[PDB]
């Protein structure tokens, strides 16, 4: 089980608590800083509940207008571009 | 010996900081050996909290008896208490 | 024995409360909701559905959140549902002089559940009377403590 | 024998503990009650 | 409209102790019947001594006067207001630790209240 809602989601979807499993700030930190660049987003914040096991709780809570599925999907998606930009400039930097 | 009439009752109207956790002890205990329930789960599925949202409500069977040293005891139901 | 409560926080906790409340503090959004949400992480304890914030205490040129702010906004946070906000005034363990000649910190001042001014140390929380957890004990219920 | 009290007991598990369980926690020598007090039980993976 | 300042002030002394950050300024103006003492940050919004100013706490933050007005917007409740030795009052609004005293004649600051502020620098 990759990402799985925690059930203190909100009944309107719009507060969520995805869980990713077998993950760390590597992708944590990243993500948020992509989140926190969406206009939509009212929070954004990550932790870890212990670092033995590895697991970390996230939160996404938005405006009513759409809710967090959306959020995380363009999140992933916009900073999955960021890679391919980075790539894309580095490659092209060296022969 | 004697049992207080409940007209004439000395003992504090206030439920113990002992009373209620033995009360909640053996609420518990009934409840996990199959007793039933008077108040609706939502979802519970801990025998013992389940009677911390009876108690909430002070929906509960079992009156407590107060022993008095000299021989007498009262018996207070549980919604009588405070 | 006496009255004084001895469960409370320690060197670290002490000594980086004593940093961040001092008024000199400054936060981004980034910052403000990061540091909120690895305070609360409601999910271990349950019991709560959403984060609640309160407004940056400045805007223009930037929006920045004090530490002050920080301590208030958790302290909105674990407010109960229907248990009005704290109000109190008590003595810092820093003395004043060490600020400033006149320094207005001095001792923590906060009513309604928003601390206000003065900075927080181990008078304020941890093994002393009177300070913030101590009142927070009384009035929240211990639980809450 | 004529003794039917069995018919009400339940089966019993043994279960092993959980994420709400309440157990002791002490240190020698317990001088005063706060020196032994019950603590909610957390099971974390790894240490040991 | 709610607002409950528009003097125009002056600095007189800008202090700057233990802190890179937010400094006290005393920009005591007006004819001298308006004594103000308060936090800013030294580093965003830089001030110097004999800095004029143009000062407005509103209630609520609602209106084209934040966008023109306001160079410089602060938020908080005040906390403390009193009337000491005369009909002259003294406020004390907290800003999340970054304080602030004035001291008015009990006019021109006397419809203040006990919530918060959303203070408006403009220089």
Redo the contacts between chains.
Sequence with gaps: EKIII?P?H?ADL??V?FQIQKEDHTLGNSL??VI?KNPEVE?????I?HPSEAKM?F?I?TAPSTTAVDVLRKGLDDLIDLCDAVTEKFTEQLP | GKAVAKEDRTTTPYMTKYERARILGTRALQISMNAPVLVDLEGETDPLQIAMKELAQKKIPLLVRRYLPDGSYEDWSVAELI | ?SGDP??GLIQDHVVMGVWLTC????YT??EY??L???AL????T?M????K?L????????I??????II?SVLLNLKPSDRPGLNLKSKAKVPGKY??PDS?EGSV?F?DG????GILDKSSFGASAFGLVHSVHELYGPDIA | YSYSRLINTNKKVYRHVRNGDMLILNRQPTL?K?SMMAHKARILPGEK | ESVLLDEIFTVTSVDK??????SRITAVSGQNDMNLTL?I?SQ??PLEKDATFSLQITSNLNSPDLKEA????????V?RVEEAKDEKVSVYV??????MAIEGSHRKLYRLSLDHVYLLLRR
């Design positions: 925690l203190g909100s719009t507060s608590t948020r800083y926190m929070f954004c914040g990550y932790s509940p709780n939160r809570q | 024995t001895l469960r008024k000199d503090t400054f959004r980034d909701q990061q909120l949400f690895q992480k409601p999910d271990e349950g709560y559905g959403r984060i914030t407004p940056p205490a400045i805007q223009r040129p930037g920045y959140w004090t530490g002050k702010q208030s600020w400033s207005e001042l009513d928003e601390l206000l001014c | 005063h706060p | 102790q233990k802190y890179q950050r937010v936090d940050n965003i919004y306001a160079d410089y917007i602060m938020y908080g409740k906390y907290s800003f999340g630790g970054l304080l």
